[PDB]
Design a protein around this motif. Structure first.
Motif, PDB file in Angstrom:
ATOM      1  N   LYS C   6       0.804  -1.222   0.000  1.00 63.25           N
ATOM      2  CA  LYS C   6       0.000   0.000   0.000  1.00 63.25           C
ATOM      3  C   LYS C   6       0.839   1.275   0.000  1.00 63.25           C
ATOM      4  CE  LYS C   6      -2.959   0.754   3.445  1.00 63.25           C
ATOM      5  NZ  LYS C   6      -4.112   0.191   4.204  1.00 63.25           N
ATOM      6  N   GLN C  74       0.979  -4.045  -9.451  1.00 66.09           N
ATOM      7  CA  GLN C  74      -0.258  -3.680  -8.770  1.00 66.09           C
ATOM      8  C   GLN C  74      -0.342  -2.180  -8.532  1.00 66.09           C
ATOM      9  OE1 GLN C  74      -2.357  -6.205  -5.899  1.00 66.09           O
ATOM     10  NE2 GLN C  74      -1.814  -4.668  -4.371  1.00 66.09           N
ATOM     11  N   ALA C  81      -6.077   2.269 -13.203  1.00 67.36           N
ATOM     12  CA  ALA C  81      -7.485   2.168 -12.832  1.00 67.36           C
ATOM     13  C   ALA C  81      -8.095   3.522 -12.477  1.00 67.36           C
ATOM     14  CB  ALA C  81      -7.642   1.195 -11.668  1.00 67.36           C
ATOM     15  N   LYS C  82      -7.364   4.373 -11.758  1.00 72.56           N
ATOM     16  CA  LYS C  82      -7.866   5.727 -11.529  1.00 72.56           C
ATOM     17  C   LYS C  82      -8.030   6.516 -12.825  1.00 72.56           C
ATOM     18  CE  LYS C  82      -7.632   9.948  -9.004  1.00 72.56           C
ATOM     19  NZ  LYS C  82      -7.086  10.779  -7.902  1.00 72.56           N
ATOM     20  N   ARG C  84      -8.657   5.328 -15.746  1.00 67.75           N
ATOM     21  CA  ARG C  84      -9.836   4.757 -16.387  1.00 67.75           C
ATOM     22  C   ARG C  84     -11.131   5.253 -15.748  1.00 67.75           C
ATOM     23  NH1 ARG C  84     -12.436   3.416 -20.890  1.00 67.75           N
ATOM     24  NH2 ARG C  84     -13.668   1.501 -20.645  1.00 67.75           N
ATOM     25  N   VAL C  85     -11.194   5.280 -14.417  1.00 70.75           N
ATOM     26  CA  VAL C  85     -12.407   5.739 -13.740  1.00 70.75           C
ATOM     27  C   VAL C  85     -12.688   7.204 -14.055  1.00 70.75           C
ATOM     28  CG1 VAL C  85     -13.409   6.201 -11.465  1.00 70.75           C
ATOM     29  CG2 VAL C  85     -12.372   4.017 -11.925  1.00 70.75           C
ATOM     30  N   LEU C 249      -4.115  -6.649 -20.712  1.00 67.38           N
ATOM     31  CA  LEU C 249      -5.438  -6.156 -20.348  1.00 67.38           C
ATOM     32  C   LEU C 249      -6.480  -6.656 -21.341  1.00 67.38           C
ATOM     33  CD1 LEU C 249      -6.671  -4.157 -18.142  1.00 67.38           C
ATOM     34  CD2 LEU C 249      -6.668  -2.498 -20.009  1.00 67.38           C
TER      35      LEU C 249
ATOM     36  N   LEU E  21     -10.143  -3.155 -15.211  1.00 68.51           N
ATOM     37  CA  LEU E  21      -9.586  -1.957 -14.585  1.00 68.51           C
ATOM     38  C   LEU E  21     -10.671  -1.050 -14.022  1.00 68.51           C
ATOM     39  CD1 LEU E  21      -6.648  -0.802 -16.874  1.00 68.51           C
ATOM     40  CD2 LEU E  21      -6.481  -1.444 -14.502  1.00 68.51           C
ATOM     41  N   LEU E  22     -11.809  -0.946 -14.697  1.00 70.56           N
ATOM     42  CA  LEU E  22     -12.895  -0.132 -14.165  1.00 70.56           C
ATOM     43  C   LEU E  22     -13.461  -0.726 -12.882  1.00 70.56           C
ATOM     44  CD1 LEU E  22     -14.719   2.385 -14.784  1.00 70.56           C
ATOM     45  CD2 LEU E  22     -16.252   0.779 -15.883  1.00 70.56           C
ATOM     46  N   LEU E  24     -11.693  -2.630 -10.731  1.00 72.17           N
ATOM     47  CA  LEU E  24     -10.655  -2.357  -9.745  1.00 72.17           C
ATOM     48  C   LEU E  24     -10.720  -0.911  -9.269  1.00 72.17           C
ATOM     49  CD1 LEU E  24      -8.028  -3.061  -8.217  1.00 72.17           C
ATOM     50  CD2 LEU E  24      -6.829  -2.884 -10.366  1.00 72.17           C
ATOM     51  N   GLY E  25     -10.798   0.029 -10.207  1.00 70.81           N
ATOM     52  CA  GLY E  25     -10.770   1.439  -9.852  1.00 70.81           C
ATOM     53  C   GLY E  25     -11.954   1.867  -9.009  1.00 70.81           C
ATOM     54  N   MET E  26     -13.158   1.475  -9.415  1.00 77.02           N
ATOM     55  CA  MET E  26     -14.337   1.832  -8.637  1.00 77.02           C
ATOM     56  C   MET E  26     -14.334   1.165  -7.269  1.00 77.02           C
ATOM     57  SD  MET E  26     -17.384   2.274 -11.428  1.00 77.02           S
ATOM     58  CE  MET E  26     -17.528   0.530 -11.783  1.00 77.02           C
ATOM     59  N   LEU E  28     -11.810   0.284  -5.420  1.00 74.35           N
ATOM     60  CA  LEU E  28     -10.847   0.932  -4.536  1.00 74.35           C
ATOM     61  C   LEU E  28     -11.362   2.255  -3.982  1.00 74.35           C
ATOM     62  CD1 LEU E  28      -7.412   0.186  -6.217  1.00 74.35           C
ATOM     63  CD2 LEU E  28      -8.263  -0.705  -4.091  1.00 74.35           C
ATOM     64  N   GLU E  29     -12.273   2.926  -4.683  1.00 70.82           N
ATOM     65  CA  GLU E  29     -12.890   4.125  -4.126  1.00 70.82           C
ATOM     66  C   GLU E  29     -13.745   3.839  -2.898  1.00 70.82           C
ATOM     67  OE1 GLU E  29     -14.806   5.677  -7.711  1.00 70.82           O
ATOM     68  OE2 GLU E  29     -13.320   7.276  -7.671  1.00 70.82           O
ATOM     69  N   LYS E  39     -18.263  11.828  -2.738  1.00 74.09           N
ATOM     70  CA  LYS E  39     -19.000  11.377  -3.917  1.00 74.09           C
ATOM     71  C   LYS E  39     -20.392  10.889  -3.547  1.00 74.09           C
ATOM     72  CE  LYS E  39     -15.257  10.390  -7.093  1.00 74.09           C
ATOM     73  NZ  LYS E  39     -14.796   9.522  -8.209  1.00 74.09           N
ATOM     74  N   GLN E  45     -22.578  10.120  -8.929  1.00 80.79           N
ATOM     75  CA  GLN E  45     -22.540   8.892  -9.725  1.00 80.79           C
ATOM     76  C   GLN E  45     -23.287   7.764  -9.031  1.00 80.79           C
ATOM     77  OE1 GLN E  45     -21.358   7.340 -12.492  1.00 80.79           O
ATOM     78  NE2 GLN E  45     -20.773   9.202 -13.585  1.00 80.79           N
ATOM     79  N   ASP E  64      -5.875  -3.878   1.204  1.00 81.06           N
ATOM     80  CA  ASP E  64      -4.686  -4.568   1.695  1.00 81.06           C
ATOM     81  C   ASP E  64      -4.313  -5.803   0.889  1.00 81.06           C
ATOM     82  OD1 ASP E  64      -4.531  -2.675   3.645  1.00 81.06           O
ATOM     83  OD2 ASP E  64      -5.025  -4.006   5.315  1.00 81.06           O
ATOM     84  N   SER E  65      -5.179  -6.266   0.000  1.00 79.78           N
ATOM     85  CA  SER E  65      -4.936  -7.511  -0.707  1.00 79.78           C
ATOM     86  C   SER E  65      -3.788  -7.404  -1.702  1.00 79.78           C
ATOM     87  CB  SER E  65      -6.195  -7.966  -1.428  1.00 79.78           C
ATOM     88  OG  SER E  65      -6.001  -9.250  -1.981  1.00 79.78           O
ATOM     89  N   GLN E  68      -5.318  -8.255  -6.093  1.00 78.91           N
ATOM     90  CA  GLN E  68      -6.418  -7.388  -6.523  1.00 78.91           C
ATOM     91  C   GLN E  68      -6.851  -7.612  -7.971  1.00 78.91           C
ATOM     92  OE1 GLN E  68      -5.126  -3.419  -5.627  1.00 78.91           O
ATOM     93  NE2 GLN E  68      -5.704  -3.570  -3.479  1.00 78.91           N
TER      94      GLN E  68
END
Ligand SMILES: Nc1ncnc2c1ncn2[C@@H]1O[C@H](COP(=O)(O)OP(=O)(O)NP(=O)(O)O)[C@@H](O)[C@H]1O
Ligand SMILES: Nc1ncnc2c1ncn2[C@@H]1O[C@H](COP(=O)(O)OP(=O)(O)NP(=O)(O)O)[C@@H](O)[C@H]1O
Ligand SMILES: Nc1ncnc2c1ncn2[C@@H]1O[C@H](COP(=O)(O)OP(=O)(O)NP(=O)(O)O)[C@@H](O)[C@H]1O
Ligand SMILES: Nc1ncnc2c1ncn2[C@@H]1O[C@H](COP(=O)(O)OP(=O)(O)NP(=O)(O)O)[C@@H](O)[C@H]1O
Ligand SMILES: Nc1ncnc2c1ncn2[C@@H]1O[C@H](COP(=O)(O)OP(=O)(O)NP(=O)(O)O)[C@@H](O)[C@H]1O
Ligand SMILES: [Mg+2]
Ligand SMILES: [Mg+2]
Ligand SMILES: [Mg+2]
Ligand SMILES: [Mg+2]
Lengths: 362, 362, 362, 362, 362
Positions: C6, C74, C81-82, C84-85, C249, E21-22, E24-26, E28-29, E39, E45, E64-65, E68
């Motif tokens: 992290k 990772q 990923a951010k 992309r979001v 990907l 990736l989308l 993963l990204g969402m 993680l938010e 948000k 959204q 923490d994983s 992911q």
DNA sequence: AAAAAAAAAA
DNA sequence: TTTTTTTTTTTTTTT
């Protein structure tokens, strides 16, 4: 107890396997009890009978293993690693001396008690090769010097001449003597990329029977080969490192090897002619043809193609002082052996037989 | 005990080893005891005798390991990562200064008592190179300045001239001095993305002996090269970031390196001439040819295409204030060494011999 | 003890690092103790000296770890990923506002106590760049309005003109102002897949140099460019999603970004030309060429190509009401700073110097 | 208890199975208990009923296992490893003797008590085949001996003749007798690489109906075959090791197999003709056509295409002493079986029948 | 405590993420605490504010994983598996019912209490679209029925009329409602087969601007579209399954999807005409021309080309009972939303204004 | 599919 | 930490 990965790597290093399936298959043969094995009693293949007794204990455990191809891949990687170290760190005369020792080891098995070869037939091949080009021993030595010196635009020799003139014969013999690969550049440019990648870490390349254009007045069919070589003239120079490619691996940067180009009498562009330091004009000879059909053991046993025949020619004709210091000891021993088994008169009668088109041994 | 992946990363970093199979080969040589080792005794390669005593203990454990290529991959990834950081973070002056320090290290070993190089032969190389183009030391400094001043669209130089005129010779020397890769764009356009991918993080590229369309009188074979360079037009400009491919890796994006284009008197489009800030016309000279025929050591040792010959030229001809401040002190020592071993009169006799076409040392 | 993955992901997010080897290279520099660290002491690179003290403890443990590139993958994937979001979520004015905000961060470190730039040179770039087209401040406001509104079939602008016309210098500046990517679509149509893949989650694309058909009457080489674009007519229109493939990907679908086509006077088919909103005809001017010639710092420091120069031009010409309400807090600070540096008189004088074809300074 | 990977490798070796999915399917058949097994009671396929009882214990534990393809992959890799070992280490006489043993093992099943075929139908095949070409038993023995000796450039045969003249009939029988694959060199030249990759580790190849460019005036369709085949000169020569590729597999270096070229009466270029030892002029026989129309079991059963019909011809006609000494025992037993079942008068009547175009069995 | 892969899969299924990736990204938010995050508070959204609350605990442990990407890959694979099951097993009514539900939920986001879209402009879209043809709601409803029932022969519709008659506008609106794709059949026959591969697994296809051959006695460009389409007879009829191929992929068999032909007014042969169930004569309407100019936001946000605009037309004009029973509840809610905001008098005034060429919405 | 590059189990 | 299992690309196809 566990399988020793070290012993598999040691076997692969001693036998010089690049081939992961061949290493797997060879090592699996060592499963069976050494005390009884028919292949060792026959002494059939030297890469088996020399090694089975040592490796039997490890090969019995290897046969139970669940990861056999992973063990063999590491061993092959260790052989490829040493080959890449040797290419970058050895002097090019050491590389040739190492090849001559490997051929001299093969000769010691061939002409001993175990081997099938008769030096009388192989020296008859020396006589037939010495009739192909004027001053053939000097031609071979001058080629070796050129391949050793690797002079940055004076690295390639052109073999030119009719059908059945002897080009591929001498090129294949020099290819075994020095070691190398044969490349077919008559294929289209989009596959040519992987053909050139076969030259990675090799000592020679031979570009075999490449086709030009402007041949139909002689019924020589046109093709793209010479246009392909002129796109690769960067690779023939060897002043700068070119980027060679094989499947899935990223490009390796090296000087592309010296070599021979063999062709029929097509026209060669002046830009490509500038890359060739010497041209040998091969001419068909009526007596060499009549001699071969009465001396068919030369073709059957592939004697006139073999690097061992040209090496025997260098041993017979060249002074001891031309060979590197390491091999001069083995070379002096082989000179004694040839003078013991042939007088000059047997060899002079062999060359007379060749010129008459009579069988070489008659 | 336990294998240290850290120590392999130290050795790879200190050796600057980009190749996984080279790193594997070299590190496995350390498994044998350094008390007897013949390459430490002979001191044949510096990449060995400096490091073996330090790495023996870890190489003995590495030789038993089952992870060997994974250990090497991470070490190589650390060496490539160090180049990525340097490529982004250093100024182009510092990158060239680092490359000069690396060449000066190599010169110290090469001309020291351990080394094989006769400085007199390499200064004869400086004399031969200076006769190729008028004011060549200014051409070299102008080129270095041009590659450090990465001015968009004023980035590339064109070398034009007939067969055996000196284009590849000088481009190969500049390639070693600055550091970079040669690229072949005569191969077909679908395959070029992996050729261009060799330019990732390199200081220069050289586009070598590229072939024009047309101009088939004068016997120049036509080819795709110049049209392929009129394609890829934004790669030469370097106003915009281009996207470069390595196998199994994502598209790296960067400003494509500056460089040299060498070509054999083909006609160039005005769109592509607009990319070249300077054209150098190479002209064949009889006296350089006869000088080389009589002073063949220049070609056998590859002196006239070496970056060290150009670095010695810059050390002789340029004032010290033109070199970077960090490297001043090392270059003043080399100027002192050259003025000690050579008078101007010995060197002017060398240049006189070159213009005479007699052997440069005679 | 374990590595905190992290903390590595936090560093990648802080520095917006999306290159796996750059992250490995950067984070390994933290393994040395920061208290004696020359790179921190000199404050060379902000991406190091901000973060070393925080990440040192973790970098020591990371240097011992055996899976370093997995940890970095990772972290990079978190950053991708951010990106992309935010591509799918953000309103398109917030996208451009974010892009201005870190251009303003970049400006703020350029012109500070650790700075390395002169505002007079960069404003001399603005004065030069404002000359290139009629009412350039209005043109850039029109372009940015089009790029935020992104109206279907009204998404692309066409820049045409002869050699050295300014179209790439403006497209490169607009590219940095919006943060797009440049796509070379002159390669074969079946192999654009991964190149169009670079457009994923971008704000602009610039098609630098699309070669046309029928240029021979103007000495312009032909190529695939225009016929590839016409086969991408649905990408240009943006009425439907397109399917974009990029490696490591799965495929990403989006409306392809708007952008600019730069084109050297080729013939363009009506089916393409009919769906560009506006064509700007660039042409050379004699006084701009003499101005750049007499003020080499503009090119060397890449000023005229830069989106920072265009951003400064937006500060100087546009009302505060044009900027987003959130960024006005920074815009108003730069507004007063540029008056504090320059009077209108020195600005008008250098506008006159450009018009007089003399050096922009004084 | 754990699954024995050894017993699966043993089944793969005893079956000579080199398809991962076939091996997986076969070994999963064995999970159902032996006493009930309907495939064993019906004796359906020998690869099941021989092996099931032995492997049931292991197949029940295999049917529960989670890594079934990994187990089969290693077993397939073990079979492929033995094939590659034997390919490099056997003499060609042993390779042919091993093929004749595998054929005679098939002949035991075909003509045994469980068998499905009538020797009289197959011997009528021998009579029809002997009439196709004069001295067919010498032609086949000379062919075997030519493929075994593999003399360089003296190792391909040309089957030349008009439509419906027995070329592909005899070539298919020789290809089954010796083992090998047919190649279609007529493909567009980009495909040719993966065609030629089929020749890897094969004992023979056959080029099926290579089309030429001539002969439109004799109603033969033009095609690229002869022009492609003349690019492959060094593949026909067999002096040098050519670099064959399958899809995705890396280049494997080997001597290309000897073989047969079949073609209609297109013109052959001298460079390609010089690589053929023997031209067999096939021509259509009225009596063989009328014979097959009245003896159609030969076509239905595939007798005249089959290598077992040519092997029966060799057992009938050739002296015992021409066979390898390892197989002579079976050849002698089969000569006694044929003399038992067929009087010479029965065979003479068959040949007299086919000469008249009467049904062979009449 | 351990990350639940089931909760990530559930989020992906409720959000319908194909994108690893989308996802993963969402996800993680969600790691930040729900009580505070912005948000959610903005309600901006729905793919976040609905789901963060429940997924917080899992997202904290997921942050923490080390797995992911693996977790997200399995979650995405579940959504792709869901799509492939639905694709093979749904009725065509359910496929359209799912598209309707997705559009209604997308509408409810646009027009809700937190909305972003002016329902009056979209109803002016309904008024402009309804004016384009006689009885447009019957044209739309009968077309949906044709595509749903997929009756052999009775399967394609011919959109025919002059240039600028709205043919591509209406086809684009029908595409987004039904989820089809568009095809370019004008190509010479060679590349047509890859063009037809666009249709794999699509619900609907449109043949855009089919050029006829015989019309160029007028201004109509002669082309091959009609004669190509005449030969594609089995694709149109839809009695039998046809082979479709996407580039680099194997052929698949399916019934070719139903569709639309959009034509300029070329002559049509009798055999092609029989395969269209209906022909729509689009004709130019001057009052619509001037209405467009006076109302242009319809074009700026493509309301008159959106599928949601046609769905609003069906909701306004057609009875609840004609919609699928599963969606009638959401359709009744949506009918009431339109009724309470638009009186029939106000809507009739919009149609009157459109008919008067008054672009004003009133 | 076959391999290179990469991640999970116990 | 030792040992086994997993993902993804290249290549191929394409032009
Ligand atoms: N000079 C010669 N005179 C006569 N026969 C020769 C000669 N050289 C070779 N041969 C015979 O020709 C065969 C093939 O020789 P080879 O070296 O392949 O010829 P080549 O010059 O390469 N012809 P080609 O490759 O078709 O242009 C040998 O096996 C010999 O039987
Ligand atoms: N100017 C010169 N005059 C005479 N000989 C020269 C000159 N420059 C180089 N040489 C010789 O030419 C050889 C090759 O030089 P090189 O730079 O490779 O030629 P080039 O101009 O690149 N020709 P090419 O690559 O065929 O277009 C050198 O090894 C020298 O022997
Ligand atoms: N309007 C102008 N008049 C004269 N010189 C200019 C002008 N604009 C730019 N330049 C010069 O032209 C150089 C290249 O400009 P650039 O816009 O990259 O060219 P271009 O028009 O794209 N040429 P090309 O890419 O070949 O079409 C700049 O570095 C300036 O030196
Ligand atoms: N010598 C023959 N005379 C007459 N009919 C024959 C002869 N040999 C074979 N046939 C018949 O021809 C059929 C095809 O034989 P096949 O050997 O495939 O011909 P081919 O010479 O290969 N023809 P082609 O491949 O077109 O050049 C056989 O099935 C027989 O019915
Ligand atoms: N009845 C009408 N008469 C004229 N223009 C109209 C009419 N209805 C709509 N338009 C406009 O026509 C323009 C072009 O229509 P569109 O459907 O895109 O082309 P089209 O009819 O397919 N012409 P074409 O593709 O050349 O066959 C759109 O922008 C509409 O706003
Ligand atoms: Mg040859
Ligand atoms: Mg050159
Ligand atoms: Mg440009
Ligand atoms: Mg046939």
């Amino acid at each position: 107890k566990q399988v020793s990965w070290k012993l598999v790597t040691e076997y692969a290093m001693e036998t010089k396997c690049d081939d992961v399936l061949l290493l797997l298959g060879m090592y699996l043969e060592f499963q069976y009890s050494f005390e009884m094995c028919l292949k060792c009693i026959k002494k059939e293949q030297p890469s088996h009978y020399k090694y089975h007794e040592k490796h039997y204990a490890n090969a019995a455990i290897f046969a139970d293993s669940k990861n056999q191809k992973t063990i063999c891949q590491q061993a092959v990687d260790t052989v490829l690693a040493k080959k890449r170290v040797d290419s970058l760190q050895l002097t090019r005369e050491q590389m040739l001396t190492n090849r001559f020792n490997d051929l001299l080891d093969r000769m010691d098995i061939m002409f001993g008690s175990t081997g099938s070869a008769d030096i009388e037939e192989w020296m008859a091949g020396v006589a037939w090769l010495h009739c192909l080009l004027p001053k053939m021993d000097s031609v071979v030595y001058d080629f070796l010097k050129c391949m050793v010196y690797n002079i940055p635009k004076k690295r390639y020799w052109l073999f030119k001449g009719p059908i059945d003139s002897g080009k591929t014969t001498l090129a294949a013999a020099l290819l075994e003597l020095c070691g190398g690969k044969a490349l077919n550049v008559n294929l289209p440019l989009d596959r040519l990329n992987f053909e050139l990648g076969v030259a990675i870490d090799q000592f020679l390349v031979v570009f075999e029977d490449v086709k030009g254009t402007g041949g139909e007045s002689r019924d020589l069919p046109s093709g793209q080969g010479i246009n392909n070589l002129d796109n690769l003239r960067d690779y023939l120079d060897g002043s700068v490192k070119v980027n060679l490619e094989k499947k899935h691996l990223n490009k390796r940067t090296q000087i592309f090897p010296p070599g021979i180009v063999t062709m029929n009498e097509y026209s060669v562009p002046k830009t490509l002619q500038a890359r060739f330091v010497k041209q040998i004009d091969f001419r068909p000879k009526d007596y060499l043809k009549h001699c071969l059909e009465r001396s068919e053991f030369l073709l059957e046993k592939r004697i006139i193609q073999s690097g061992i025949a040209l090496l025997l020619m260098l041993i017979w004709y060249r002074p001891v002082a031309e060979f590197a210091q390491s091999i001069q000891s083995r070379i002096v021993e082989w000179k004694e052996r040839l003078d013991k088994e042939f007088s000059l008169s047997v060899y002079q009668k062999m060359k007379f037989n060749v010129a008459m088109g009579i069988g070489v041994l008659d």
